[PDB]
RNA sequence: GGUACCUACCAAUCGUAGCGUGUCGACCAGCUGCGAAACACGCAGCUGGCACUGGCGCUGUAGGUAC
């Protein structure tokens, strides 16, 4: 490829009203043919800025674009709740066009302890020859959490998949799910199944368990 | 008034071919350069191709140079992206975009195109097995119990999950899909609901996997 | 003689016998405004080249023609 657009930062957590600045560096000159887009999860991008400083019609005035040589800066003065999203820069000075890596702007809030739930496998799945035990960490902040599985007391490892949701639009919290998959026989062979969660909002690791 | 609706996505094998269409309304494509961008799952935007007005000149990214072909039908007001010799790096949501007018939003992409998913894999389409995640019988965590549905072993993306056929939306969390060791997707859709009203209320999860044309309605119930 | 004109006036150097002059335009590149317009095409303008166009000013020498 021809020109490279290196974007920074890759992400950040900002309170409402905070000013945020994202910077894209072109590997070589691109004149002022730079654009900035905002993208929400599961949605198409929207033109925020064009020509390295001009505002697109309909875009609020807290979004600004500036240029200094080969450096371009998108500035959100006084970040608002509807502004959390992934921002991308683009160079259209020459083909092929180049996009930045993107900057994911998420909202910062007070820490919320997760709500831990455990779900045993259903009889249908057991009949199918497999068992999936699910641990659910509901509505917590920050995103970082630790979850460990224990059958009997053997610290499990290498048999659990993890997924996490995007920041909630209403309360800005996160939700996470761990899934431990065993065979029918393997699942019958042990009694107690437990999920241990450590998080900044929990003074002590919380355990949620059941008996087959 | 200006809309860009594309179609043609789906699943295709490595080395296979596939064409995407992008119908435009509210403006004539012949008077604007039209671009194809793409975004791999959980990745950044990747410019793919472009076609200029009045000359028809075509430009391509290095990753797809020689394999993709952009074209346009003015009588149908539609752009087209042919993709040949597809690799596993070509799987992504493909967006059709229209470059703005020179004297307003110069070279900026106003008005993008919803999107269409293209999956490149040798795995075969399979519908999900839907199991229930029953409410915790032990206590109920302060008047709010949690239930859910487990959508396992399906391919390709996507699936859609609703609760009570759209009647229930509060406190719903449908988690992103993850590739299991088997090569298929799996996720869970959970909900938190008043425990006191658990027995009285009925909770059903509606899973739809259009690729395999499978639709499942699963009860939960405390047992 | 005079005036006007015709022809010729080494090579190199755009050209000229020589000196000076680089254009209403052509051509090569680059830039800008505009045409629904990044390239290409079109219209208008600018900058640099070039000398296709061999014009214009001045000054001749030889021969010759005509008043
Ligand atoms: C001062 N210098 C040297 C600097 O390098 C020069 C050299 C040559 C030159 C040549 C010139 C010729 C023209 C002009 N104007 C010209 C005009 C009209 C037509 C026609 N029909 C054809 C041509 S002017 C000029 C100036
Ligand atoms: Mg000579
Ligand atoms: Mg000549």
Residue ranges per structural domain of chain A: 5-107, 115-211
Which residue does chain A place closest to B39, by CA atoms?
Answer: A44
B54 touches strand C (CB under 7 A): yes
Strand C contact at CB of residue A95, distance < 7 A = yes
Q: What CATH architecture does domain B129-218 belong to?
A: Sandwich (2.60)
Query: Which of A50, A122, A175 is the closest to B108 by Cβ?
Result: A50
Question: Any atom of strand C under 7 A from CB of A94?
Answer: yes
State the CATH architecture for A5-107.
Sandwich (2.60)
Binary contact (B44, A115; C-beta < 8 A): no
Q: Cβ separation of A44 and B173 shorter than 8 Å?
A: no
Burial class (CB in 10 A: 0-12, 13-18, 19+), B1: exposed
**Resolution to 1 decimal, in Å?**
2.7
**Nearest-CA neighbor of A65 among B112, B35, B34, B108?**
B108
CA distance B98 to B4: 8
Give yes or no for CB of B57 within 7 Å of strand C. yes
In degrees, to the nearest 5, what angle opens at C-alpha B49 toward C-alphas B45 and B52? 125
Nucleotide closest in space to B56 (CA vs C1'): C40
d(CA B115, CA B207): 22
C-alpha angle with apex A208: A205 to A211, nearest 5 degrees?
A: 145
d(CA B119, CA B18): 11
Q: Taking Cα atoms as reference points, which of B216, B144, B160, B167 lies closest to residue A42?
A: B160
| Highest CATH level, class, for A115-211 | mainly beta
Tokens of B12: 């295709």
Give the distance between the most distant pair of CA atoms in chain B. Answer: 71
Q: Positive or negative, the Cα torsion across A34, A49, B40, A81?
A: positive
Distance A89 CA to ligand 3 centre (A): 55
CA distances from A166 to A105, A109, A175 (A): 12, 15, 8
For A197, the token pair is 């969660």
Do A103 and A11 form a contact (C-beta atoms < 8 A)?
yes
CA A78 to CA A23: how far, in whole Å?
Answer: 17
Could you tell me the distance in Å between the CA of residue B72 and the C1' of nucleotide C29? Answer: 34
At residue A188, φ and ψ (nearest 5 deg) are: -70, -25
Q: How far apart are the CA of B104 and the centre of ligand 1, in A?
A: 46
Write down the architecture of domain B3-120 according to CATH: Sandwich (2.60)
Q: Would you give the distance in Å from CA A201 to the centre of its chain?
A: 19
B83 strand-pairing partners? B18, B68
């Amino acid at each position: 490829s021809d020109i490279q657009m290196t974007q920074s930062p890759s992400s950040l957590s900002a309170s409402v009203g905070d000013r945020v600045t994202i910077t894209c560096r072109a590997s070589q000159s691109v004149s002022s043919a730079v654009a900035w887009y905002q993208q929400k999860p599961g949605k198409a991008p929207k033109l925020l800025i064009y020509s390295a400083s001009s505002l697109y019609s309909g875009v609020p005035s807290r979004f600004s674009g500036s240029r200094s040589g080969t450096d371009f800066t998108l500035t959100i003065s006084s970040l608002q709740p509807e502004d959390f999203a992934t921002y991308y820069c683009q160079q259209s000075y020459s083909f092929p066009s180049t996009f930045g890596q993107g900057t994911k702007v998420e909202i910062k809030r007070t820490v919320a302890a997760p709500s831990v739930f455990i779900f045993p496998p259903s009889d249908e799945q057991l009949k199918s020859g497999t068992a999936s035990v699910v641990c659910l960490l509901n509505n917590f902040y920050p995103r970082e959490a630790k979850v460990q599985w224990k059958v009997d007391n053997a610290l499990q490892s290498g048999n659990s998949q993890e997924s996490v949701t995007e920041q909630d639009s209403k309360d800005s919290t996160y939700s996470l799910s761990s899934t431990l998959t065993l065979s029918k026989a393997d699942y019958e062979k042990h009694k107690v199944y437990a999920c241990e969660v450590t998080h900044q909002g929990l003074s002590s690791p919380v355990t949620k368990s059941f008996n087959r | 008034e200006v809309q860009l609706v594309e179609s043609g996505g789906g699943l295709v094998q490595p080395g296979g071919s596939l064409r995407l269409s992008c119908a435009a309304s509210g403006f004539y494509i012949s008077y604007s350069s039209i671009h194809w961008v793409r975004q791999a799952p959980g990745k950044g935007l990747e410019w793919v191709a472009s076609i200029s007005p009045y000359s028809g000149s075509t430009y391509y990214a290095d990753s797809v140079k020689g394999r993709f072909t952009i074209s346009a039908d003015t009588s149908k007001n539609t752009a087209y992206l042919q993709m040949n010799s597809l690799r596993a790096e070509d799987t992504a949501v493909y967006y059709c975009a229209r470059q703005g007018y020179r004297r307003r939003s110069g070279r900026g992409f106003d008005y993008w195109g919803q999107g269409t998913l293209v999956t490149v894999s040798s795995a075969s389409t399979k519908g999900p097995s839907v199991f229930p995640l029953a409410p915790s019988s032990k206590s109920t965590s302060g008047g709010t119990a949690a239930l859910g549905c487990l959508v396992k072993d399906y391919f390709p993306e996507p699936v859609t999950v609703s609760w009570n056929s759209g009647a229930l939306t509060s406190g719903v969390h449908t988690f992103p899909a993850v590739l299991q060791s088997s090569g298929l997707y799996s996720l869970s859709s959970v909900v938190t609901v008043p425990s006191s009203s658990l027995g009285t209320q009925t909770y059903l999860c509606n899973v739809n996997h259009k690729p395999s044309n499978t639709k499942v309605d699963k009860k939960v119930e405390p047992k």
